[PDB]
Design a protein around this nucleic acid. Structure first.
Lengths: 95, 80, 162, 83, 81, 73, 82, 72, 62
RNA sequence: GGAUUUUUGGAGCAGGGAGAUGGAAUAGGAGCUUGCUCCGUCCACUCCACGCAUCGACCUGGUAUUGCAGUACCUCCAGGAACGGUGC
């Protein structure tokens, strides 16, 4: 209801979800350390308690061994990463 | 607001899901539910180091799915 | 009576006594062998007993064939290219057919997983050195017609037919 | 509620099952006592652990978070679930 | 017919006597964190003191001390002293 | 919340297989409805033939793969 | 919608969580969707470890297997309703 | 006694070393751990094998991986 | 039946949605839509917006 | 109704060394085609720690049973290993 929805809003605002809070306020490009070691970069659109992150302008990178690892990197326009695969949520990246 | 209705508000739109079993499935998924329960319909799925297998009725699991890819011309504000 | 897809769709496909996924044709009398692909690879055994099948050929592309039952047949000759359509087919129940010639099983060598066969009550079984040509030209088969292949008979089958 | 596959495993209780756990462990034996938490205390089982040497032991107890699969008696094809 | 040997009772006994113990891991027999548990909680997550994670293979230990092991990775604690 | 049917396995000598390939033989005395156990004289043998007894251990149901009871209890 | 009930009673090849397969006529379902496969076939991979030997997929007889939700990942529909 | 929820109450603000389940570590100030106990760490140095390789600074470290979070 | 697309209609529409997705996965830019895709892919020998010296040539070949 | 027994996951990672052994009909970059030389993905044989031990069928001989039953797998010796996967 109203108080509980406000409580989830506060969990997004002044909790450990402040990363996604900035990601949805200033639209900071977010690093998404996936559990498969896949690095995702893009602007966020939506957030959840379970760390479900909606993303935009998404780039996906992964180091493939053909050796010498090659950093493959491609684009998915929009993205959606429900809170299962995401290991770490980095608000500000170096790029 | 969890992503339940953001995932469930979808039917038979050409999208690309990534199953956590290193595989991808693109197509018109039939219907999604609240706990990330989505089926596949006439979907083309590529596995880890494998072939472009075709599925006429495949039932994709929820936490075994690693990510989702929506259409490019869909307003995420109007979707989530 | 043409062999058709109704006599495929009304057939029984189950896990038979040998834990093999068999499609069965009870009372078919089909003298035309083709169009088994919609078997859908949920099957490994194909039984077509009580058939007027004049020739041993005309089968589609399946990867998991396990048993082929041509039991109670009327085969005259055998087609050759059974191997690319049966990669690892092993059991062939092919008795009661009009096999005579030593060249009636020349396409048999193309079977890579061939392990057992039964061609009894055929004019080809009664001949001398017949099991010799059998255990030679099917080198992979270790048992045929309810008796295993042996080192001595195999050496004799190598020596002969040279 | 209560799941009908779990009800079929209840109908397969007492009698022999052939289960496989997380470590490939194949336990083939009488699955006696079980719970809706898939925690099944069983007996008279040949537990192989997927290494090939199955040992015939008594009073095993296999959970279900490890459970890869479990073969339950075919005679339950007339169980009230499917019909 | 039987009574409780409760897990929270064992955890409280450890944290109250300052019982040092090595705590294993989930998915890995590799590391064990030997130390005295500073406290317990509802979901069996314990805080640590004087803990060092020592490997069975490497035979080396990295010090954590006041460690905070997650509750799902906990396998079993073996009382050292 | 359901408790297990562990009251028979109570006070029994049990050889259980825990994750990481571990083999622990011990005495069940009383458990928690989550199968959260405490094992008396619990001797957890390593991969090799070397084993050790550690007395009182609160073991995981996340790490315990299965368990066997060597008596009819 | 409990969608599965429309495709049940006919044969599907499901996956395991370790890359294998389970082909069978889906009998009944639960909340967690742990499956009940009747006369199931377990088509798994055999480790090749070589380029000079082929890659084969052998399937044993499971019968009625109650595959846990830790095995139900994705299940294509491949068989007619038996 | 130190229950872990008061442990995070006292260690929020201090230098947390967060070692994940893959061994991924971050040495930085931990900001908050909520009812989901997914931690938040800022001014983080990403330590692999105990040697910081990157500085991700502000980040939210999901709880599903962090093996331990200790005061360094 | 096996060679017709639904968006196609047996000769009314084309099979190019995957082509647009591949153009996106190649370009890595959000400033490319259906209008730019058509203005780039309609020309026979008009100026390339994407490289015929890179994997864009193989993508155009596909 | 993501904190130990089923779906917001503990997954992902790569295949032991080396020898003036070979191959890339169609695919490698450099020495600014060919001739020659180097290097970062396997297999085939040969060397070492045939990766080992375990066991389940399996191929060959010899070897016992004549035995009315609703089934994990059933006599035993020996091997050479064509296989499954476990502990390092």
């Amino acid at each position: 209801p109203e108080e509980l929805q406000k409580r989830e809003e506060e969990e997004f605002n002044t909790g450990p979800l402040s990363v996604l809070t900035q990601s949805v306020k200033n639209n900071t490009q977010v690093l998404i350390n996936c559990r498969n070691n896949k690095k995702l970069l893009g602007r966020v659109k939506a957030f959840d308690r379970h760390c479900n992150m909606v993303l935009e302008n998404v780039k996906e990178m992964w180091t493939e061994v053909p050796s010498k690892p090659v950093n493959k990197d491609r684009y998915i326009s929009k993205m959606f990463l429900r809170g299962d695969s995401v290991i770490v949520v980095l608000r500000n990246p170096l790029i | 607001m969890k992503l339940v209705r953001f995932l469930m508000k979808l039917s038979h739109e050409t999208v690309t899901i990534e199953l956590k079993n290193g595989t991808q499935v693109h197509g018109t998924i039939t219907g999604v539910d609240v706990s990330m329960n989505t089926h596949l319909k006439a979907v083309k799925m590529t596995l880890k180091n494998r072939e472009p297998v075709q599925l006429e009725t495949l039932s994709i699991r929820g936490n075994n799915i690693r990510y989702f890819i929506l259409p490019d011309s869909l307003p995420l504000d109007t979707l989530l | 009576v043409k062999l058709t897809a109704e006599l495929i769709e009304q057939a029984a496909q189950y896990t038979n006594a040998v834990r093999d996924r068999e499609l069965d044709l009870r009372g078919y009398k089909i003298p035309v062998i083709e169009n088994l692909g919609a078997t859908l690879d949920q099957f490994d055994a194909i039984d077509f007993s009580d058939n007027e099948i004049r020739k041993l050929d005309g089968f589609p592309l399946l990867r998991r064939l396990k048993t082929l039952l041509v039991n109670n047949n009327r085969i005259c000759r055998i087609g050759e290219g059974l191997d690319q359509a049966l990669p690892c087919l092993t059991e062939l129940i092919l008795t009661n057919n009009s096999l005579v010639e030593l060249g009636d099983l020349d396409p048999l060598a193309s079977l890579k997983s061939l392990t057992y066969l039964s061609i009894l009550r055929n004019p080809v079984t009664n001949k001398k050195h017949y099991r010799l040509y059998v255990i030679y030209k099917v080198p992979q088969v270790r048992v045929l017609d309810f008796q295993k292949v042996k080192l001595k008979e195999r050496q004799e089958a190598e020596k002969m037919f040279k | 509620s209560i799941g009908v596959p779990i009800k079929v495993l209840h109908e397969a209780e007492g009698h022999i099952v052939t289960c496989e756990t997380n470590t490939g462990e194949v336990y083939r034996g009488k699955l006696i006592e079980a719970e809706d938490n898939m925690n099944c205390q069983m007996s008279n089982i040949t537990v192989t652990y997927r290494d090939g040497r199955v040992a015939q032991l008594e009073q095993v107890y296999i959970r279900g978070s490890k459970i890869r699969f479990l073969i339950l008696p075919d005679m339950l094809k007339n169980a009230p679930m499917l019909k | 017919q039987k009574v409780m040997v409760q897990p929270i009772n064992l955890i409280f006994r450890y944290l109250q006597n300052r019982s040092r113990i090595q705590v294993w891991l989930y998915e890995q027999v590799n590391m064990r964190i030997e130390g005295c548990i500073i406290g317990f909680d509802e979901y069996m997550n314990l805080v640590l003191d004087d803990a060092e994670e020592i490997h069975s293979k490497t035979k080396s230990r990295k010090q954590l001390g006041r460690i905070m092991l997650k509750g799902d990775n906990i396998t079993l604690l073996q009382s050292v002293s | 919340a359901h408790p297990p049917e562990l009251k028979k396995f109570m006070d029994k000598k049990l050889s259980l297989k825990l994750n990481g390939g571990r083999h622990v033989q011990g005495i069940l005395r009383g458990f928690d409805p989550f199968m959260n156990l405490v094992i008396d004289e619990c001797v957890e043998m390593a991969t090799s033939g070397q084993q050790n007894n550690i007395g009182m251990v609160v073991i995981r149901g996340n790490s315990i793969i299965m368990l066997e009871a060597l008596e009819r209890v | 919608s409990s969608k599965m009930l429309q495709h049940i009673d006919y044969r599907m090849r499901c996956i395991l969580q370790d890359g294998r397969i389970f082909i069978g006529t889906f009998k009944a379902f639960d909340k967690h969707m742990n499956l009940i496969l009747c006369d199931c076939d377990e088509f798994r991979k055999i480790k090749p470890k070589n380029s000079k030997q082929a890659e084969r997929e052998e399937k044993r007889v499971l019968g009625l297997v109650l595959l846990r939700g830790e095995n139900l990942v994705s299940m294509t529909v491949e068989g007619p309703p038996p | 006694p130190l229950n872990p929820k008061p442990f995070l109450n006292g260690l929020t603000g201090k230098p947390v070393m967060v070692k994940l389940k893959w061994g991924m570590e971050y040495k930085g100030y931990l900001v908050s751990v909520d009812g989901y106990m997914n931690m938040q760490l800022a001014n983080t140095e990403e330590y692999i094998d105990g040697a910081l390789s990157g500085h991700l600074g502000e980040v939210l470290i999901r709880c599903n991986n962090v093996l331990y979070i200790r005061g360094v | 039946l096996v060679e017709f697309t639904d968006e196609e209609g047996y000769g009314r529409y084309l099979d190019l949605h995957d082509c647009y997705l591949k153009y996106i996965n190649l370009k890595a830019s959000e400033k490319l839509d259906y209008i730019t895709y058509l203005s780039i892919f309609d020309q026979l020998f008009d100026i390339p917006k994407e490289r015929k010296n890179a994997e864009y040539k193989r993508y155009l070949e596909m």
